[PDB]
Structure 1
Amino acid sequence: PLESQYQVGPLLGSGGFGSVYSGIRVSDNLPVAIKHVEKDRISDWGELPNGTRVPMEVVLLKKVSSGFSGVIRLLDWFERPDSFVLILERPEPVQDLFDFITERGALQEELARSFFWQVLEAVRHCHNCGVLHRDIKDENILIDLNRGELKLIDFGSGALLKDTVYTDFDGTRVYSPPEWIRYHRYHGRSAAVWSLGILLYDMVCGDIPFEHDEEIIGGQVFFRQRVSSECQHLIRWCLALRPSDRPTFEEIQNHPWMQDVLLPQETAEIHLH
């Protein structure tokens, strides 16, 4: 049973993803997050090997939750008459990246490099597991403030990774690529790389580069803050208007700006403790 096994705490927030509560596992006081989403509000459904009808986010989470990684792992889930409840890892202490950037402003490039690098490894993990997240953004990244580790959250807009075109998208628009805006068509990896460019800009400028569709499809990148030539170059590359002109994950991680990354722990010691 759900609530004999978990002590529920405060509401952490709610929105399109459902409602998320702090909690602890009673059997060992493991910190968890407990996410409730109503069945009515569930768009995408998939199924587990044993043919149980589950939300797609459960399928995608099971696929990425094997092994250690930069993704918040699904520990358990329950079906209720009108909702599903998901039990997820909870770092403590934790702050999401949107909160973190809002609070502290544009990140020093050393910190942005460590963060961006960890996001790339987490996204590579997802893709290795056949999962495309489709809503990579500051709000979907938790910072473990003591370990200096980033963890991806919210696969509620995700899909199985494929090599053919995607013609659906219910992620965040301002992180969405120009080919989606104007054609309602994108391919998974190149659309991911676009969102990563948006994310890198956000980190080093303290805000996203584009608000309106017109700016997205123009894709002219203006820098409001002092940003290094190498960083500007990588950002402009990720935000190439033609998807085929964007770097692969390998090309990103081999970019001059991405060399000499800090380890998570030393990232925390220097920037977070």
Structure 2
Amino acid sequence: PLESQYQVGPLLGSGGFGSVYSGIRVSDNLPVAIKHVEKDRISDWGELPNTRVPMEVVLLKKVSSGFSGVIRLLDWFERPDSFVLILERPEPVQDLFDFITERGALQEELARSFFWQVLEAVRHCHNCGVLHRDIKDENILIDLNRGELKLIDFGSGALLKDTVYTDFDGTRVYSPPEWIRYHRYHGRSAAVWSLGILLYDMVCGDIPFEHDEEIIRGQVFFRQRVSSECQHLIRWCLALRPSDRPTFEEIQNHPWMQDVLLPQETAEIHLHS
């Protein structure tokens, strides 16, 4: 142990998720990402099956398995003042936020493939009892070679439950109106709301709401040409009342989600890889 298993490379990014470095595991030259999180900033703590660890570690372990769609936790270390998490690192990779910044609004065929993969990944998290609570383009990585998307940054998540949530530390512009008005939400329809924001972001090039009162009003204006089926799915996910929002099954059965590209054909056509 003790930092002799990994060569540290450039800093990839830093923020609310801590500091993430590009890395290489020296045992087999495996590309990894090294994330440092200070203990002082960790708000939620969990406990592993038979030790006091951050909730992010608990959630990552519950979702780290053969399914690609979530960036997997390979290992973790505890330091006196911080936790260090070893995560897989696709190569090459670009976060969805910067991908949208460079390309603008995405073609609906590309947005369909991306959105479908996000749904499959979120469904996987829920099946494992994990609620992400911060679904957004900044927390999605693109494997440019394979055309596969990856969820990251579970540092705001929680265990999935069927009762109401009264806390939230995700991105406010992605939060549902029931959180803005009442500080109450249930996990999955809040998730569907954020998926609606995400889908609008992909097909329009930016998020639909910037202020609390626009979220509360829930009125969706499209600044780009978007098909009627895509507009309908977005407005469905952005329904004001949580119970009017579609389930994951209803999203993936929607007419706009039919005949999705596979990941590798997505990369060949739209990522030219």
The TM-score normalised by the length of structure 1 is 0.99
For residue 223 of structure 2, give the secondary structure of its aligned residue in structure 1: coil
Q: Distance in 2 between matches of 1:148 and 1:125?
A: 18
**How many angstroms does 1:3 deviate by?**
1.3
Q: Distance in 1 between matches of 2:2 and 2:18?
A: 17
| 1:62-112 deviation line (CA, Å, top 9, x unaligned) | 000022220000000000000000000000000000000001000000000
Can you list the C-alpha shifts for 1:29-62, whole angstroms capped at 9, x where unaligned?
1000000011011100001111x10000000000
Note the alpha carbon deviations across 1:190-212, whole angstroms, 9 max, x for none.
Answer: 00000000000000000000000
> 2:5: which partner in 1?
5
Cα distance in 1, alignment partners of residues 226 and 67 from structure 2: 33
Match of 1:40, SS state, is: helix
SS at the partner of 2:35? strand
* Aligned alpha-carbon RMSD (Å): 0.5
Flag structure 2 segments of 5+ consecutive residues without an equivalent. Answer: none
Give CA deviations for 1:185-239 in whole Å, capped at 9, x if unaligned.
0000000000000000000000000000000010000000000000000000000
Aligned length: 272
d(CA) in 1 for partners of 2:67, 2:8: 25
User: Is this contact kept in 2: 1:69–1:125, CA < 8 A?
Assistant: no
Q: Residues of 2 paired with 1:120 and 1:61: CA distance?
A: 18
Query: How much has 1:184 moved relative to structure 2?
Result: 0.2
CA contact (8 A) 1:107 1:205 kept: yes
User: Aligned to 2:141, what secondary structure does the other structure show?
Assistant: strand
What SS class does the counterpart of residue 153 from structure 2 fall into?
coil
- Tell me by how many angstroms 1:152 deviates: 0.1
Deviations 1:120-174 (A, max 9, x none): 0000000000000000000000000010000000000000000000000000000
Q: State the partner residue of 1:246.
A: 245
Cα distance between partner residues in 1 of 2:170 and 2:68: 23
Q: Which residue of 2 aligns with 1:224?
A: 223
Query: 2: distance between equivalents of 1:2 and 1:59?
Result: 22
Distance 1:159 1:68 in 2: 20
Please give the secondary structure, in 1, of the residue aligned with 2:184: coil
**Contact 1:20/1:35, CA 8 A, preserved across alignment:** yes
Distance 1:193 1:68 in 2: 21
* Alpha-carbon distance in 2 for matches of 1:2, 1:271: 42
Alpha-carbon separation, structure 2, partners of 1:68 and 1:167: 30
What SS is found at the alignment partner of 1:4? Answer: coil
Give structure 1 regions of 4+ aligned residues with deviation exceeding 2 angstroms: none
- What is the Cα deviation at residue 2 of structure 1? 3.4
**What percent of counterpart residues are identical?**
100
Distance between the aligned counterparts of 1:183 and 1:143, measured in 2?
35
- Contact (CA 8 Å) 1:35, 1:87: kept in 2 or not? yes
Name the SS for the 2:31 alignment partner: strand
Equivalent position SS for 1:195: helix
**Secondary structure, aligned partner of 1:3:** coil
